[PDB]
């Protein structure tokens, strides 16, 4: 493999924090998990996986508030019930009761990122050269505007415009370390389905994330 740097940008974005999920407050930047999820919406096969090495932030960080009427708890049943016939009308109250939540998103604006990513090979590989074929298929798809689904920027309410960046990583807005980003999520683990969080090295120009598949945490 050689790595590939994709450019992804949009008007809105919401990479929700883990704490502030009900009244969403996004991270300042795209996290590695969201980035890999963007990638797997352009090309992905169960033979490969995506790892992220860097994420370049090319624009100011600017927040915005948008409240939406949203379904609340789909509350567990207090009394079991069954439909009168097989295929007939059944519903969900989205306007009466406490089934209207009005969640307030503190989502980003006018975001622009460049993701560096690579190709490991897992079980169900089939061969040891899958990296080349799949990397080149993804490159073709990025160039031709093709995709399995329109990538989002967090939620599907915000679609991501994506191009294949083959030139130099363009001028960013951050040339000296005036931002530290705190302590972010690395990538939701699925071997144990837990939350490994990584940030122990500052963000200088491009967030330098460790591979989620080798060092799950500084604890280990």
């Amino acid at each position: 493999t050689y790595g590939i740097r994709l450019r992804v940008w949009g008007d809105y974005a919401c990479f929700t924090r883990p704490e502030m999920k009900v009244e969403r407050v996004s991270y300042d930047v795209m996290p590695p998990s969201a980035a890999r999820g963007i990638l797997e919406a352009i090309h992905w096969k169960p033979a490969i996986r995506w790892i992220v090495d860097r994420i370049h932030v090319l624009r100011p960080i600017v927040f915005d508030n948008v409240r939406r009427n949203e379904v609340s708890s789909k509350i567990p049943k207090p009394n079991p019930a069954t439909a009168m016939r097989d295929r007939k009308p059944l519903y969900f109250l989205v306007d009466d009761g406490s089934n209207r939540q009005q969640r307030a998103a503190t989502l980003l604006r006018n975001v622009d990122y460049v993701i560096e990513a690579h190709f490991e090979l897992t079980d169900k590989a089939g061969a040891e050269d899958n990296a080349g074929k799949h990397l080149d298929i993804f490159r073709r798809r990025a160039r031709a505007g093709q995709s399995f689904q329109q990538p989002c920027l967090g939620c599907r309410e915000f679609p991501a415009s994506f191009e294949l960046l083959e030139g130099d990583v363009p001028l960013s807005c951050y040339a000296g370390e005036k931002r530290d980003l705190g302590y972010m999520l690395l990538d939701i683990d699925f071997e144990r389905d837990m939350t490994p969080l990584f940030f122990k090295a500052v963000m200088e120009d491009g967030v330098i994330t460790p591979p989620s598949r080798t060092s799950p945490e500084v604890r280990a």
Partner: peptide
């Protein structure tokens, strides 16, 4: 804190989604 169902992600119990020293496997 989570008190509803639609704030369930990668199903966790009720407050393990935002685990900060509550479940000591990882703290944000």
């Amino acid at each position: 804190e989570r008190t509803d169902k639609c704030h369930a992600a990668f199903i966790a119990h009720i407050k393990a989604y935002c685990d900060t020293a509550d479940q000591d496997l990882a703290a944000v």
